[PDB]
Amino acid sequence: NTYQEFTNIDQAKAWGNAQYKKYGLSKSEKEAIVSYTKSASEINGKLRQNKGVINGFPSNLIKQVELLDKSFNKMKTPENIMLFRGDDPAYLGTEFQNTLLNSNGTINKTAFEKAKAKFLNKDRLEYGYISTSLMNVSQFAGRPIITKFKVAKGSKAGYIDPISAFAGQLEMLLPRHSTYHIDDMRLSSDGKQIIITATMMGTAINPK
Numbered sequence: 001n002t003y004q005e006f007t008n009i010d011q012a013k014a015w016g017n018a019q020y021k022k023y024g025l026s027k028s029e030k031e032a033i034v035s036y037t038k039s040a041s042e043i044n045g046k047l048r049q050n051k052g053v054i055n056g057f058p059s060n061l062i063k064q065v066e067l068l069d070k071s072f073n074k075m076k077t078p079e080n081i082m083l084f085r086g087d088d089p090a091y092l093g094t095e096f097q098n099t100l101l102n103s104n105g106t107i108n109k110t111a112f113e114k115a116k117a118k119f120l121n122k123d124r125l126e127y128g129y130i131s132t133s134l135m136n137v138s139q140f141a142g143r144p145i146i147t148k149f150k151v152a153k154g155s156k157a158g159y160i161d162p163i164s165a166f167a168g169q170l171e172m173l174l175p176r177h178s179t180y181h182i183d184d185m186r187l188s189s190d191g192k193q194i195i196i197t198a199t200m201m202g203t204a205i206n207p208k
């Protein structure tokens, strides 16, 4: 299976904007998505902490989460696509927070081997929503960990960039409680980054 990889910002925006125009999101769904782009770290943090159980959340956050979940009934990718993220060391676990990079700003080889043993050829379940970009955009592309997600035609995925509170992110949102498989992990040419290739399986949250 081949996955569409956008190579040009204008081409990516054109395609994304075309997708967004057809979603027919409701007023309430749009409000929930706007708020997500302002408060994603709080929302995803609480989802991770509680392993996806939202019963104890404030009433307004339950409503927001259920609206985001339901919005994916309208938001699917029309083709196999590649999506991107940049992550900081803690993404690999607490043990990598202050050990992944050496004093030169280069990936420590012992940490890289430990990360490979931990994640290579394994599944990973994410309790939060996954914010991605259509390309490796500048804002996040200098982070030490770059992930390329292979997302199959028909999968829940939404270009929310047109109503995001923030610019330059080419943001495609993926549903919460998604599982992906780490296929490949290697250092970059200059040794400053870990490039991860993963295959998106899909989400366990499927209302309606």
Ligand SMILES: NC(=O)c1cccnc1
Pocket: 084, 085, 086, 087, 131, 132, 133, 140, 169, 170, 171, 172
């Ligand atoms: N960390 C990221 O790559 C990212 C992508 C899109 C929106 N927000 C964050």
